[PDB]
Amino acid sequence: SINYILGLDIGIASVGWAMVEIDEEENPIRLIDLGVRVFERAEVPKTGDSLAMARRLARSVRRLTRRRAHRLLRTRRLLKREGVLQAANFDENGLIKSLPNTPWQLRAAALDRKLTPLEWSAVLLHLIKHRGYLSQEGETADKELGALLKGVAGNAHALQTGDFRTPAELALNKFEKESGHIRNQRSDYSHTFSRKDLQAELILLFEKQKEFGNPHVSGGLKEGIETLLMTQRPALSGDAVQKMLGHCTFEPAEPKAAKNTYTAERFIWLTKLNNLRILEQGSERPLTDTERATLMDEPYRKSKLTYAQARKLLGLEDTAFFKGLRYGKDNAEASTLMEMKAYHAISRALEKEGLKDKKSPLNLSPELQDEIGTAFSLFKTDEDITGRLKDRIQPEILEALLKHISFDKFVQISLKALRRIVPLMEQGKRYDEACAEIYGDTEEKIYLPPIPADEIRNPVVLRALSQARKVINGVVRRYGSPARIHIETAREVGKSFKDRKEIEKRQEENRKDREKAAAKFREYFPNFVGEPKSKDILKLRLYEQQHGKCLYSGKEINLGRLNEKGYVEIDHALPFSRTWDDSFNNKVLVLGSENQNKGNQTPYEYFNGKDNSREWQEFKARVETSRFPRSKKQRILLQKFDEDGFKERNLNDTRYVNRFLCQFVADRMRLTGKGKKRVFASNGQITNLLRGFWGLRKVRAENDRHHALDAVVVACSTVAMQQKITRFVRYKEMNAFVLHQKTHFPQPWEFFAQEVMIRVFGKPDGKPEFEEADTLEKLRTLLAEKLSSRPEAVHEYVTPLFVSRAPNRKMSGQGHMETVKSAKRLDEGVSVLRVPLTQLKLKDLEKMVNREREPKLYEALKARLEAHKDDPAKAFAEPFYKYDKAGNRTQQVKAVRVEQVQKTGVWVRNHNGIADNATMVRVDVFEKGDKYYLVPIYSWQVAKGILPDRAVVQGKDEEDWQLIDDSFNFKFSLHPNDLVEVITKKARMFGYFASCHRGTGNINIRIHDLDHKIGKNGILEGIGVKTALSFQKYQIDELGKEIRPCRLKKRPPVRS
Amino acid sequence: SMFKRAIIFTSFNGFEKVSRTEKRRLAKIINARVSIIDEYLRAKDTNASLDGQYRAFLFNDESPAMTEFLAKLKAFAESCTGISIDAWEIEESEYVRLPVERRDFLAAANGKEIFKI
């Protein structure tokens, strides 16, 4: 039973944790346990797609093909029921025998001639199979669907205007004569037809065949066939889409709804307006009631209320700048600040159709606007919306609205709750005050409950928080409930894939910008001790940025005497002791002589700033005429800030993830905290500062282990430690004497740096060449030798760090590769694939099936390919034909058959095709005669239920493998990311199984911490286990403990 | 050891058309020297920043980089028949001792002329 703080460091693919045993006085004294837990981040890695997307797309494809086949089956059953095929025109399975293959021609000729049961059946089945596109009205808004719609609408207009009478006749004549094909190809939506046109054609065909005397034009048949051609299931209902999103959380009975809503838009507007404060050079202030009243109605009156436009309305007078606005960017005040999208969308729809006098206020009630928003956000068809708003608004207005309007995107509050909030908020009263006044807002247990997927709407964040939960629960099980939990989450957690990519881009931009700056520093100071740190480049940059003038005095400063120690200091304008702010906005370059009488005062409070002393006016003029950004100049001259509030905002991180985590862990965990918040979300900047100043230099390490290092720092950041640091900084700004030399910046305890380094990396810092203390003996002896002074540096919990990789024992997944190949010539190791000429490369054509039998074609294609430098899409961009012996042109070519290698595969499409293996889900390991045999198990084998017979052999093509029988002893099954041990002749290999090559029977294992010095990027490749001495599989928990060999009894099956 | 600021003033001669490509060349020349320390003399492509502007670049005249830069500037000036560059040179001691109101002008006045073109 120990009193300890648990420090967590959360990122998109790692959680590092540390345990610190503290005094009752909350001072950190003992480092107990640390670990790292790494997983794969919850997105498709290269593109940022979600893992669910790949599965959902396949699901919708499954449903589409299934429903089409079912509809066609019902059509055939209806044909039999209505006499049309009379009996046993069908085959052993429900398909019609001797069905004609000319349905386009028969459809076109059905208008002029009585058809036949076979031809009539073919026509109706063809109409059912190809029933064209359905509108689902105002559809012009989406990249392609626009293109398909362009083709559809073009062909519909051409059908009705140019006299061709039906889709069949127009399609036949135009497509055959002008293109040589009817059905679309490769992506083209040129010949697509709308369902309306095909329904008209079906009606006309029934009329004509009644005219010509077709025994089967029964009312039953017409009813059935029309219903089959027109019916499809309803899209998601209002209540169903509402069931998808949570209850309001304010009024459980009512749902959260409708961004495009007068009430919702007004909530957004009032939140912005109430939170909008203007900073004028000097200090901050919020809008007076008259200013808010002035701006309140302008978003409705104008199209958008631009920031500069708002400056016009208030006569704001430059030297008055908006806060929450990047003013360095040029013409920044063209930003929107507010746009009522819904109000103006409704207004533009009415304006554009003749029901609204433009720039006359929309007279519709707030209730009606809310209703329109909810209706248009909940239904995706004209009919449904038509009913909903047919209840409450006049017909012409609704028809106009159904045109031009597309709505989406809900906002997590019930219109009843927002209705109560926005009258309360209009009065004034920031959001939380009104919310508490209307409905003011705790069941503790030992173990953190699962992360609520509702509050965390993000897959990456959900997986990161879930693995943090697993880490927490394991730590608590092993050591009991923690006193406090400190949290430090990466900047990248909770950011769009676009956002993270752009952040990486600018990080590299800053890398090269700083390298250029460093080169400039080297040129200016050629003789310099080693390489320039960050503060040195900042010194030079501030020197040039300040006009070569010390900002506190205006006395010129000698360049080249910059690194003459103590000549120039980087002063914090606002004192660190009172603000805990060391931004790049709070750093000025001053002389050592002048920066000794400032004390712990702000620049405003030191140049008096209250009587406008001419020293203060000189200083303010100096800072305003420097090449400082606006933000920096604002901060330097703050005058009237909230000391404690400002240092608090600079001390912790208030992001969405961190606030949610602090409230969640505080609510539902044991956590024997003293009582004030018991959960702390450390600001990243201050944590990096503490790392640097506590001797934790940012190492040059591949290890995921560094994640634990940070976790230690955040765990030592306690209120007592913070106040001790503040006191030290205070006594340091007033020139301490309480001696001078031995006044190390307060550390959690002595030799903290060295012990933490040994504990995390198993090496004394600065010796990456040294060998690691792999074992308890090695580590404890190293700690007792290089930290003989420290009594508690060794104890019963000090074990080497072993990073824990979340396992993946999933038995499911892609059964085979996506393209299906011809399997006829599979006795020979080959398969055939139709390769277009646009994709045709020389190494494809060299294996054409008809390379021997089409020598003219072979030579023509080969020569053509030689030209244009083997560029497939370029070479065959102009139509390619075949030629007879007499030189005549005969017939085009679109694609040729190409041979491919195929030694293994999966049977697909009614055993009429072969596809490549996808990904192995398991490897069964057998021992026979001190040699190891790997049987690979793929997912299609799991589906079919066939526990494989044969184990790999290096070079034999798949057929000739070692058949496994009861003479072999089976040891274990390997899933991806299981811990394995390969004791071999060369060395001893330990690590997480990653891949098992099937052409070699070797396996790759990731080193647990992915140290780049080992293998290539931490992966041992091509380890041969056939002739290993030992080959065993181990188990490991979240924390990296309990590492034991596991012995399986029986080989497990593939299905249950 | 001793830091020299090269004050260069870019003017338009009026004689000939501006030749936007020449503006790009001059922008590249000036921007070669700019880094985040003295990014405030970023070379734009419009006349407003290229015509009639003083820019003071800091060099270390115990390094042969100043001379190459000024030679490139002179070569461009000879090329452009319609853009004129004037170069000066001042010790950074006297430059920083000037009053920051029109320092580039005053330093040009107080500096040994280098090349007029």
Swiss-Prot record, chain A:
Recorded phenotype for the gene knockout or disruption: Almost no mature crRNA or tracrRNA produced. Loss of CRISPR interference during plasmid transformation.
Family listed: Belongs to the CRISPR-associated protein Cas9 family. Subtype II-C subfamily.
Free-text function comment from the UniProt entry: CRISPR (clustered regularly interspaced short palindromic repeat) is an adaptive immune system that provides protection against mobile genetic elements (viruses, transposable elements and conjugative plasmids). CRISPR clusters contain spacers, sequences complementary to antecedent mobile elements, and target invading nucleic acids. CRISPR clusters are transcribed and processed into CRISPR RNA (crRNA).
Enzyme class: hydrolase
Cofactor(s) it depends on: Mg(2+)
GO molecular function: DNA binding; endonuclease activity; metal ion binding; RNA binding
Protein name (record): CRISPR-associated endonuclease Cas9
Use in biotechnology or industry: Coexpression with both gRNAs or a synthetic gRNA in human embryonic or pluripotent stem cells shows it is possible to target and modify a DNA sequence of interest.
Residues binding Mg(2+) 1: D9, E488, E492
Keywords: Antiviral defense, DNA-binding, Endonuclease, Hydrolase, Magnesium, Manganese, Metal-binding, Nuclease, RNA-binding
Domain notes: Has 2 endonuclease domains. The discontinuous RuvC-like domain cleaves the target DNA noncomplementary to crRNA while the HNH nuclease domain cleaves the target DNA complementary to crRNA.
Domain HNH Cas9-type: 496-651
Organism in which the protein naturally occurs: Neisseria meningitidis serogroup C (strain 8013)
Transmembrane segments: none
UniProt: Mg(2+) 2 binding residues: D9, E492, H707
Listed GO biological process terms: defense response to virus; maintenance of CRISPR repeat elements
Active site residues according to the UniProt entry: D9, H572
Subunit structure: Monomer. Binds crRNA and tracrRNA.
